[PDB]
Amino acid sequence: REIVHIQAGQCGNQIGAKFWEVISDEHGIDPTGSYHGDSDLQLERINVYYNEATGNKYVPRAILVDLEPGTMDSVRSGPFGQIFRPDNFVFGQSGAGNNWAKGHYTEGAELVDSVLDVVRKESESCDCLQGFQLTHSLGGGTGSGMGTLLISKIREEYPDRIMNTFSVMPSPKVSDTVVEPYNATLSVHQLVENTDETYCIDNEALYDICFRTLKLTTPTYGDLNHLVSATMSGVTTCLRFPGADLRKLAVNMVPFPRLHFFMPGFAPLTSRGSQQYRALTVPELTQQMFDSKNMMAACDPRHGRYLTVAAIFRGRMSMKEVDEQMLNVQNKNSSYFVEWIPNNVKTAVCDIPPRGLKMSATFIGNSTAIQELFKRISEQFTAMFRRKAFLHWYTGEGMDEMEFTEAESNMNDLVSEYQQYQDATAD
Amino acid sequence: RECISIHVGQAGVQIGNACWELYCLEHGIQPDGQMPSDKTIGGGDDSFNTFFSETGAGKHVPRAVFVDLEPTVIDEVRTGTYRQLFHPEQLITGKEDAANNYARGHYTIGKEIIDLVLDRIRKLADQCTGLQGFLVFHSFGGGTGSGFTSLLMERLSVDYGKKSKLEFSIYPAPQVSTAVVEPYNSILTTHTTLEHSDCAFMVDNEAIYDICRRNLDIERPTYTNLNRLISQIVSSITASLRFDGALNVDLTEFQTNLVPYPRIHFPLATYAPVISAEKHEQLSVAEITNACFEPANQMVKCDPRHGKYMACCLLYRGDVVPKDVNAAIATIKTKRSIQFVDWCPTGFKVGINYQPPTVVPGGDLAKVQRAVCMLSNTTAIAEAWARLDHKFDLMYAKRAFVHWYVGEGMEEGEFSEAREDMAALEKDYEEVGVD
Amino acid sequence: MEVIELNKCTSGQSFEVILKPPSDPSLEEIQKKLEAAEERRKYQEAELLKHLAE
Amino acid sequence: MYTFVVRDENSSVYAEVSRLLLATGQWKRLRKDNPRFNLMLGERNRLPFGRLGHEPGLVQLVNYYRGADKLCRKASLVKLIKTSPELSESCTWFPESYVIYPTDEREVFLAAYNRRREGREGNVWIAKGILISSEASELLDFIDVHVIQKYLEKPLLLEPGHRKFDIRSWVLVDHLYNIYLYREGVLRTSPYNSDKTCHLTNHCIQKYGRYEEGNEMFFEEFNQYLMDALNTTLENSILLQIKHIIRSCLMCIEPAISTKHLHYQSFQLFGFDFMVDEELKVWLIEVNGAPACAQKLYAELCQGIVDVAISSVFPLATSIFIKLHH
């Protein structure tokens, strides 16, 4: 039943904060944790993400982690910052210098027992814990390095619980430092081994959606994070509203243990040019949802094949019309679904739409196209590593080169794995 | 002679709910358990007492156990209209479910809850002066419905070796399922359960879904729609045990009348008529009998014309007299394609119960003056094993999703052993049925 | 045709229409399987915890 | 748009129907094992009928009637005609035939043979790997499942040349079980000597070709010959009888094979084989469930299949068929 939420580092806490703003709103929980909604449906499954405090106050089951205090302070000051349990902010002062070795081995080690203490206290009060969800980036140092350290320690203490992540991948187009390929390649290694489902959110795709479709000339991290929180709200609707526990979702979405990296999508994506108020029809939602221009990993689905596809519709709309359009698109893209997993496209509907939208759709795909994202990281990693460029920041934290080689070798193996299943047929 | 019902997993529990609700309507049992026509208080051994015992305050209590590895579906029972009917011991819930993983339902969680279930079943058995056996309701595709049910049936053969066990099993349909692993769970549970079931009635959700769209004109049926229709079929199949009658009045007669070969123990059910309550033209005995040979009215879509009948049984409810049945049988046999195996007699066992079908007030099914459920053991139902077996073969050739089962302590070899058992099942049907 | 075995109860009747004549594992073994499964799960867990300790 | 798959890489005819579908820009071919198809151009043998009609949201059509072998197996055709109430007494257009295994009619065969030789009547039979012979023992030593059929000793001989022949007619049965007889038939032709060459008219048992191109003669000419040679027409002297035989055979099995009210739908193209004796009487020889076509006719007939059987169910955005009624 219950999920424990962790958010780590700058990117993780900023996206994490918006996610809680959004879904708190959807559940009628105001910024002080008081409920003021109008439907039993909002409270039916409220404990999945919220603990109940005396006086019908709802407190997010959220742990906030970081190695410098800046972003934590900004959250407490943000809209719903009062909503978070004060004891659940865990943070240091050194920072991680955008450096995976510092997040994972030197600065992070110091702080990790304190995070595990808060996790234990939240777990112990769970009637029956489903699992954990972590939001973080892979290009920085705290989200990437400490985040994957956290997942390793959680798995050791809770080996039989589900571990899912929303993981922002780096891209040169929206880049903070040149070492990002190193931090992400070291993290994918961990994720391959220790998560059950990872939602890959590529900052390049986020940017391009804001630029090309939303017609936003100069997007901000605020913009990107709004897209991500709407997508996070969509994928978790089946957990927060009547309809699906984490394990049953992973069993039906993950056909091989290592290929559990998903491509999310959202619709509608429209320009606010006196179109925003136009009622959107079920055809429009469904065509967008499967369009490349709508997917948040910079991967061409037409370049690979889908293993599984979950599509979630929100709002009041014809359930009949929904099936008609989901079937229509499978006939269109018949080529893009493997034929050896019968009935691998599945649909859910939920009547509670997001704030401000009569209907919406979220797409969750396990596509071999994702291999393109990993091979891009691999290419960037290799360009630097072959010259040992910027390696001294990591070897100076006690890491050896051999750990970089293993991580690179592990990701390339992953890429070849996607390639095998893309070419596999029922013949 | 008592019957104990066992409802396993979400599909079994919710179908069990629709059935017991219907029973109460049919027998005149109020939601609070009281039965005004039952003039023997706290006792008696009438026909309906095969499904209900009686408290001293006059309550009529189903002879039922509800088990689910997750509590939210059984909480419905605890809070429904007929909550006042059951007591806590009859409701057994775990904390977390099998996640559509047969291995998790059978090995990991099954091992831990089976003795409690058997203990609760034992507590009903000890209330029975002459226990007949068990009716077991479950889905093929659920981790619990598939995985725990096969564990339970093994153990029931151990504990009640001389008792009959019948199955009502929901066969998986993509129209109303979100899972992709149900072909695995389906084969795994059929292989392990086969030696332990005397007679299994499969309902294909696809068929129920399509009968609800077409006959009741429901754009998108819900489980509630599907379960009300299923409970009509269950009720007419079990009415012989619950009402004064002569045909199929004890569980062993089901095997005797429908199952010459132990492994071929899956009769095809066909029901008629299904009529939208919003409508109507009232069909004849010949017409509804003719409807029983329409693939569109079957609980599993398949084509009986291209198989062989081994046995065939007609259950009528309502305004039906024998002369009507015989004239209707005579006519249809000159028109339709019907070929029995040469080593069986070409004939029908007919039962008429004069009480017309009962419906849930305010439900989608119209009250009709007569209806019929045909139970026929056709080799044509082998089509459904072939469909299921082929989906299994497609995923299994790439070992897709196998790691989830192995990770729960199952051996990869069990997939093969189960699959090869199904291959033999298909071979058995072909031998019986083809020239 | 031939109609046989006509039983007339008060709740209806029953009869047969003929149209043409013709021409286990013990409890211990179950236990072994379940405990076997348990041990394979426990072995797999121990490898995991050993691997994490490394 | 519509989707179909191809699973008989040897279908002369449906290779052309497949190419036409593609030319319409509104059909696309998925790999042979993709389950989400509207049309299956299926395999001659073991076609997985029981997996058709269970794909959500998909109307599925196939080009074979499950159960139609009852008419297209030479052994099965005989048992059907003999034991079908609809044809048993009524069948005066099928040669006396017997089933014989190496439910068997060995004893009955000998009974009519004795009548024949004893009465000194024509007593030449053809078992079918064929063998035409007049002594009953010479035939059976060859069979040790075949059928033994009375060989038509007085066939209508084309002149000049004194040549045997047979008539192929193409029949399309759509999903609604309308019976469409293709306007065009072919004769396949041999001099007859009362040496298996002038006795077997198969296009392979001949391949020669001086009288007509490819030993095949079409209806335009065969009609003119009947007019010139015998003062009758193809329609009056033969085609009425052909239409009656097609209707009898196909209406007989309709309850066993019709796909109306079934969860998937069938159509099928048939080739009936006929003989004409010298009293202008027509005789059904066999029924082929997987026929090729006359090279000249592939174009027109394959377009008729698409028009009448395929597009009739999956519509796109005069008549070559005679409709045989009910």
Ligand SMILES: C=C/C=C\[C@H](C)[C@@H]1OC(=O)/C=C\C=C\[C@@H](C)[C@@H](O)C[C@H](O)/C=C\[C@H](C)[C@H](O)[C@@H](C)C[C@@H](C)CC[C@@H](O)[C@@H]1C
């Ligand atoms: C810039 C376009 C704004 C609105 C559109 C007309 C449309 O909604 C609509 O037609 C109508 C209503 C949307 C209501 C919600 C969702 C609200 O969060 C929108 C937010 O205030 C607007 C913009 C934020 C601050 C980000 O810059 C943006 C990137 C978030 C992202 C979810 C928008 C996708 C659109 O397709 C959206 C759903």
Ligand SMILES: Nc1nc2c(ncn2[C@@H]2O[C@H](COP(=O)(O)OP(=O)(O)OP(=O)(O)O)[C@@H](O)[C@H]2O)c(=O)[nH]1
């Ligand atoms: N007809 C019908 N089918 C149902 C119902 N509930 C679930 N199903 C079907 O049953 C299958 C899912 O299995 P469930 O019964 O939900 O699973 P379970 O036995 O509860 O086991 P777990 O949830 O995995 O622990 C799918 O094929 C569903 O379509 C129901 O109430 N009626």
Ligand SMILES: Nc1ncnc2c1ncn2[C@@H]1O[C@H](COP(=O)(O)OP(=O)(O)CP(=O)(O)O)[C@@H](O)[C@H]1O
């Ligand atoms: N009863 C009969 N009397 C006279 N000729 C006959 C006959 N039965 C068969 N034949 C001749 O033998 C030839 C082959 O017959 P049949 O059709 O039974 O064999 P087959 O199926 O191998 C060839 P196809 O499939 O092309 O028609 C026919 O073309 C016909 O001329």
Ligand SMILES: Nc1nc2c(ncn2[C@@H]2O[C@H](COP(=O)(O)OP(=O)(O)O)[C@@H](O)[C@H]2O)c(=O)[nH]1
């Ligand atoms: N979408 C998004 N990406 C971010 C945000 N903040 C940082 N990033 C990206 O995350 C990576 C840097 O990681 P960061 O979270 O800042 O480092 P950390 O604090 O040590 O975990 C780079 O890929 C940045 O583009 C944010 O708020 N939104």
Ligand SMILES: [Ca+2]
């Ligand atoms: Ca009583």
Ligand SMILES: [Ca+2]
């Ligand atoms: Ca032939």
Ligand SMILES: [Mg+2]
């Ligand atoms: Mg930063």
Ligand SMILES: [Mg+2]
């Ligand atoms: Mg369940």
